[PDB]
Amino acid sequence: EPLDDYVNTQGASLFSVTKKQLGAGSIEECAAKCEEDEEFTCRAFQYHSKEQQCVIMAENRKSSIIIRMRDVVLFEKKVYLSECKTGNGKNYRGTMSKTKNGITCQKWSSTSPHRPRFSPATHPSEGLEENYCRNPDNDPQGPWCYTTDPEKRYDYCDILECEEECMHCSGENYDGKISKTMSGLECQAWDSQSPHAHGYIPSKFPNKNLKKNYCRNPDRELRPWCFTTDPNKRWELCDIPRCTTPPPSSGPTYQCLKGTGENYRGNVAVTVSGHTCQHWSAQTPHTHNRTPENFPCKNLDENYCRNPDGKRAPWCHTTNSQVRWEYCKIPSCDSSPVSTEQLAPTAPPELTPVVQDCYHGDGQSYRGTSSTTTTGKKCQSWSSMTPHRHQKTPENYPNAGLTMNYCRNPDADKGPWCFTTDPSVRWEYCNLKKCEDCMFGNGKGYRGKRATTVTGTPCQDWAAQEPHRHSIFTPETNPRAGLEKNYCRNPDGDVGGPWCYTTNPRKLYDYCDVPQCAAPSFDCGKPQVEPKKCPGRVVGGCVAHPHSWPWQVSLRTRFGMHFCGGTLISPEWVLTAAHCLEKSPRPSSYKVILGAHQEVNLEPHVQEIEVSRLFLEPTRKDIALLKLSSPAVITDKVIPACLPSPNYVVADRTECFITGWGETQGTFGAGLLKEAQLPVIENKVCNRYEFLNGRVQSTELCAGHLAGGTDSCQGDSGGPLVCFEKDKYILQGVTSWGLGCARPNKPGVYVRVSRFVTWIEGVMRNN
């Protein structure tokens, strides 16, 4: 495969009883010893990178327990976790224990109520474990088992089909291997940006299984699709066979309204305004794609009101030629303790401090809002058991402050950590500083002189084999690692940073506390005042924390009139909308005010700089660069925004903020810099019929709600659209207003800065 038949998890340790531990040089060496199946059925394996040790065990996460641990990588045989069948299920190794009639199996190792012809004695290679359904003889009828019913020798079991060959419904959970489209074009790999830049980044959506270049349905499309290797065709649906087998267990269904009516299965066929529903199977008077064929699991029967998509309530197309569709008025259900308006996760907002938060000692007392690991991954919520199950819950650790997905230290480790939202990485340390000799990143390159572990124990010399023998990480094994004397080093680029073997006889190795290098002064996109980060569901947004958006520029006329926003990109350059320059072609007609919060009564520190140059982006003419008469003085209130990497495509749902001075009369916060949190709406979704029917080009980006959020124009023309990313804010969009303001059930459209970076940096190096 080679390891495509395993599920890898870094930082995970499955505890086992029936095992075999031994020395190995590599994961592949270790994997081989697992495949060379003797004594027991190796169901999983652990590799301890720093110890050359390899554990082979017959246990799985299903049958045992996993814990957070250091260095170790866990590899679990997919086959044994796979609770579905393929063809006849010859290779099925699930846990189904009742037949298709629901009768309890007998064990393969029992001789009562039936004395079996197939057993573990006779068919050692057959997986005849417990009372579980298996196909020893490869019967075309699929898994069966001997029965606990005495007058019934065996019977077949009802194992749901494996989405390898086929898809159920619309392929939401399709994990098959088809990698070409309807037309036959080979799919572009999800982890690649060529020939198509896109927001479906696997690392951003690990749980969406955007594996290699396979057709997938991560966003409620009609069917699985992919981006294509054809530069002329961005994306296309794939041709995925539909399964004949029954779809997996889903419910409960109501004949009354509960929530958004996604579970409605009643017979109402009239809208609120009294219109007759058009049959879903019909294309007159209106053409559509919401057909029983495309959405089999949605029960789009006759012309009954249904909510097959993500709408507010049930709806239907109408037989009225003048009203394409309308919502139906379904009577709400009665009282019950399940659909009390409580279910689903949604995930918390990104409240991680930009002004890098710090911790004291081992950080067991840290109570901050940081929720980003050392590698930029998002923390999993302590109350959630997905993607990682664990016992570090507020119930088990009442005083650890285990709330939301914030970085904490419940188990008294070296510093705050969290379970990660990436299925392949159980947990990592948090991106936090501990309240010259320093490192960069994980310190693989660190060659400093620190020789002390986090506990105070000195390091053992790398050349020494006492107190600790070590077959690896000697100056001869790793000649390029700088393993001199007893200096803290990161030869293996461990996520934890520099470490060393310790002189403590009872502790083999440990981390050293090597600080991250300081940096010269003010970096782009790093406000010196923490943005308040206005929550989504607020009309008109919030008043910004003064100077929390230091790249925010106010474009003014020669008569103190604020009429536009802009973004400071460097000390002599501001990016704004070309629309801002419509009134005058004279650079002198413009005043750029920096570090302001007040719109009219400017604070004494505000910088007022005249524009000396006006450069209009030629290809689109939608944005323009303003060169300042003199360079801006960079302070804690005037800092430029970072620019994205060329063609970077902000991932769908990325939370961003639009800032600017609102021109709204009857409201609080007049003449004050405001901000509004907007999630990015990926172009493929933004472009669908229901919103902006093919009206959005790639040199643009969408941001804002699709469920009646707002109906006005946020920020200022030319104002910033910034998106936090790991450590800083990046200017992803430029407000253009005339491009299309965010209306109810439609996002706003901005100029995608990433498509104009080469032009900008171009204009900045020549002029």
Ligand SMILES: *[C@@H]1O[C@H](CO)[C@H](O)[C@H](O[C@@H]2O[C@H](CO)[C@H](O)[C@H](O[C@]3(C(=O)O)C[C@H](O)[C@@H](NC(C)=O)[C@H]([C@H](O)[C@H](O)CO)O3)[C@H]2O)[C@H]1NC(C)=O
């Ligand atoms: C998820 O996004 C949605 C929209 O898609 C919401 O914005 C949501 O915020 C929550 O709204 C719902 C109601 O629509 C909840 O009632 C929620 O409050 C809870 C929660 O369920 O997460 C209630 C609960 O007491 C507690 N969580 C538990 C017990 O798991 C916390 C919190 O302690 C209480 O709200 C305080 O009484 O939140 C709203 O906060 C988004 N989800 C988030 C932000 O997790």
Ligand SMILES: [Cl-]
């Ligand atoms: Cl754990």
Ligand SMILES: [Cl-]
């Ligand atoms: Cl038999």
